[PDB]
């Protein structure tokens, strides 16, 4: 009694996604961004496509490069992807990893000198996520050992064992800071959904390659925190910012984070094999996906950016909510069997192909305005790597493969 798109449609979508990943996204990253002056990868590519090898380089971006090429190598086997992941890994260990106090710096100069030495849990999480993926792709002992050490530092220096979750930012020597903001966009509050979502993401990937008992308890506690404090059943949206006791300190809505969390929360519970928790997580996951479907979409099926603190709808199409909606809508289809979610995934894919991707300049535009005009944003910067759209294509390819095997 399944309602399944026919084989032609599944295979056609899968082929377009694979072409987008390999002939646009990963081709752009492998050819435009490696830096032969300082090694590793440039920190910025302008809207004109010009790389900036002297620009400061962020840990999050470089972890995202590592994760994406590692995951693409694991799933597709292409030797160039292993080469690019190795390039990212070597620069990362040399320069971003703090050999003295542990963890990864926030920002380094192009030549690798530390520029911003704060230890932000969001950056520590992406390091764990990328290093665990690199271990998964290669079996590398050093990568896994490093991920484990950063996990230990997060728990040692940041875990709030009274109220749950984590202090989100420390200085280089792991002393907590007051200002945990990732950027000027973020509320000056002590707890954020965003950082906690990527702790969960990192811990789930680490657990898949290192199923330690205590880590299972920390991962389950994070899932439980999302269900009890962050997910809002009255609205189907994540609450974005909190005080230390998880009292809400924001009313903004991030559609991209909702639909990302929808599928990441289920990935995390399944990595645990926590069948007792799964019903409640699936319920919250499907709710987030439905709320996104009903409230976060333009008539073309693309995702709006946010509802701000004063209620303003930001109708800009940022690249990464579209990617996350591709995965989250396919995931909601797989979980519920409701083909309306597949139709939604197809619609966002068509938007990606017709508006978000930059066919002339390569990769994807960071932002497209509601009237269709691409903004002249950087193509690569501190916050724009290959991870959201690379992962979304990899996930879609594998999910469509599974669906194709129902026949
Ligand atoms: O507010 C911090 C920055 O967010 C960025 O988007 C992130 C997003 O917060 C989240 O972590 C997502 O899962 O990854 C995204 C892509 O970098 C950007 O909006 C940036 O401008 C913000 O400063
Ligand atoms: Cl990214």
Can you describe what's shown?
The structure is a monomer. By secondary structure, this protein is mainly alpha-helical. The chain has a single domain (7-404), classed as Alpha/alpha barrel (Glycosyltransferase). The protein has 12 helices and 14 strands. It has helices spanning 7-32, 59-76, 79-96, 121-138, 141-158, 193-209, 213-230, 255-272, 278-295, 319-336, 339-356, 387-404; strands at 57-58, 107-108, 114-116, 119-120, 169-170, 191-192, 231-232, 237-238, 241-242, 253-254, 306-307, 313-314, 317-318, 367-368. It has a 3-stranded antiparallel beta sheet with strand order 1-2-3. A 3-stranded antiparallel beta sheet has the order 10-11-12. Strand 2 and strand 3 form a beta hairpin. Helix 4 (121-138) packs parallel to helix 6 and helix 8 crosses helix 10. The longest helix is centred in the N-terminal third of the chain and has 26 residues, at 7-32. It is globular, with a radius of gyration of 20 Å. The two termini are 13 Å apart. Bound molecules: a molecule of 2 linked components (BMA-BMA) and chloride ion. Chloride ion is lined by residues 64, 384-385, 387-388. Residues 64, 384-385, 387-388 line the site of chloride ion.
């Amino acid at each position: 009694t399944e309602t399944i798109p026919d084989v032609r449609r599944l295979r056609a979508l899968q082929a377009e996604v694979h072409e987008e990943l390999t002939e646009n996204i990963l081709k752009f990253w492998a050819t435009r961004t490696p830096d032969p002056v300082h090694g590793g990868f440039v920190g910025r590519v302008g809207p004109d496509g010009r790389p900036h090898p002297e620009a400061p380089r962020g840990a999050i971006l470089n972890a995202r490069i590592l994760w994406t090429f590692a995951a693409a190598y694991r799933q597709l086997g292409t030797p160039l992807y292993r080469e690019m992941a190795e390039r990212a890994y070597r620069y990362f260990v040399r320069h971003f990893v703090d050999a003295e106090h542990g963890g990864v710096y926030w920002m380094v100069a192009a030549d690798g000198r530390p520029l911003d030495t704060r230890k932000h849990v969001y950056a520590q999480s992406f390091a764990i996520y990328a290093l665990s993926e690199w271990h998964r792709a290669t079996g590398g002992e050093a990568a896994l050992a490093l991920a484990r050490s950063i996990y230990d530092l997060i728990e040692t220096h940041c875990a709030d064992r009274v109220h749950g979750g984590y202090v989100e930012a420390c200085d280089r020597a792991w002393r907590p800071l007051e200002d945990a903001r990732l950027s000027a966009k973020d509320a000056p509050e002590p707890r954020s959904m965003n950082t906690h979502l990527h702790v969960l993401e990192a811990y789930a990937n680490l657990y898949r390659v290192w199923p330690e008992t205590e880590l299972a308890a920390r991962l389950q506690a994070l899932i439980e925190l999302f269900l009890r404090a962050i997910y809002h059943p009255a609205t189907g949206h994540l609450i974005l910012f909190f005080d230390e006791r998880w009292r809400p300190r924001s009313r903004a809505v991030s559609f991209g984070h909702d639909i990302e969390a929808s599928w990441l929360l289920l990935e995390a519970v399944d990595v645990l094999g926590q069948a007792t928790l799964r019903p409640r997580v699936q319920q919250a996951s499907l709710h987030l996906a439905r709320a996104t479907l009903a409230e976060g979409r333009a008539p073309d099926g693309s995702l709006y950016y946010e509802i701000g603190e004063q209620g303003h709808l930001d109708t800009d199409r940022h690249w990464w909510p579209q990617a996350e909606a591709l995965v989250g809508f396919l995931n909601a289809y797989q979980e519920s069997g409701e083909v309306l979610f597949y139709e939604a995934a197809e619609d966002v894919w068509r938007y990606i192909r017709e508006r978000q991707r930059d066919t002339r300049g390569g990769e994807w535009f960071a932002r497209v305005r509601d009237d269709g005009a691409p903004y002249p944003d950087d193509k690569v910067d501190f916050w724009k790597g290959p991870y959201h759209n690379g992962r979304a294509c990899l996930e879609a390819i594998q999910r469509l493969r599974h669906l194709l095997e129902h026949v």
